Design a protein around this ligand. Structure first.
Ligand SMILES: *[C@@H]1O[C@H](CO)[C@@H](O[C@@H]2O[C@H](CO)[C@@H](O)[C@H](O)[C@H]2NC(C)=O)[C@H](O[C@H]2O[C@@H](C)[C@@H](O)[C@@H](O)[C@@H]2O)[C@H]1NC(C)=O
Ligand SMILES: *[C@@H]1O[C@H](CO)[C@@H](O[C@@H]2O[C@H](CO)[C@@H](O)[C@H](O)[C@H]2NC(C)=O)[C@H](O)[C@H]1NC(C)=O
Length: 216
């Protein structure tokens, strides 16, 4: 496994987005992961539609929450996902528009990363960006500005993000996590959470519900 990796530098990550006042973090995490695997496999970096997922993932609750896997499943069922441009983000629940359906990026499947193991998560991230859930309900996390996050947080899966890499600084390991709260939050929209900590659940429970899309 590489000592460090940054999919942003590898050109597999599109600029940070903003979910706004819509509880669709799960959709943004799913899209980021798919955008990553597509570029890694095809070389083309395309920004995908979170709105389509919000409107079409019937098992999820749109702006009221949802999980990434059901979203991955929709993309599989739909034979792909629309581009961000053809199905723009509205930040609110809407009808799954079949009239505008035109998948540009498709995936074959998706897999879960063996939980409670930062080494396993690292192996997955070394191959592609990984969708994860973290506890972002605390003040420390939400008020994070820069540096390696070592603040106070539990392990509840109340927020979905995308790990786009990992590295080390000042003898402290960290995960490079892409958030969907805009570029004004954290380090230009990213948060470097401490990696290889004591608790098997990882920082803020990052190793609890991690999964990634599979594209042959
Ligand atoms: C997330 O919050 C839970 C509470 O739901 C923490 O667990 C409680 O922690 C207190 C001490 O602060 C302990 O006396 C309770 O037994 C424990 N309750 C349950 C149901 O486990 C939990 O903190 C964890 O901290 C470690 C050091 C240890 O005390 C452990 O027992 C405890 O669960 C928080 N979990 C994480 C991963 O941060
Ligand atoms: C779904 O997307 C389509 C396309 O953006 C929307 O329908 C078009 O709406 C324009 C403006 O109202 C009309 O001029 C077009 O005739 C419509 N397309 C077609 C093929 O007739 C539609 O409003 C969106 N919403 C829903 C629920 O389908």
């Amino acid at each position: 496994l590489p000592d460090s990796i940054d999919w942003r530098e590898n050109g597999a990550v599109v600029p940070v987005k903003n979910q706004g006042g819509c509880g669709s973090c799960w959709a943004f995490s799913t899209v980021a992961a798919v955008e990553g695997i597509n570029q890694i496999v095809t070389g083309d970096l395309i920004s995908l539609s979170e709105q389509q997922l919000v409107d079409c993932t019937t098992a999820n609750h749109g702006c009221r929450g949802g999980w990434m896997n059901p979203a991955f499943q929709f993309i599989v069922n739909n034979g792909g996902i629309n581009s961000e441009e053809t199905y723009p983000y509205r930040g609110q629940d809407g009808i799954c528009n079949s009239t505008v359906n035109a998948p540009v990026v498709s995936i074959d499947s998706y897999e879960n990363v063996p939980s409670h193991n930062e080494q396993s998560l690292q192996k997955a991230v070394a191959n592609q960006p990984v969708s994860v859930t973290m506890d972002a309900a605390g003040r420390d996390f939400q008020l994070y500005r820069s540096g390696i996050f070592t603040g106070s947080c539990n392990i509840s899966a109340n927020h979905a993000l995308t790990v786009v890499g990992y590295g080390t600084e000042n003898d402290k390991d960290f995960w490079i996590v892409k958030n969907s709260w805009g570029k004004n939050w954290g380090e230009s929209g990213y948060i470097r959470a401490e990696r290889n900590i004591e608790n098997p659940d990882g920082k803020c429970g990052i190793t609890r519900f991690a999964s990634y899309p599979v594209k042959k």
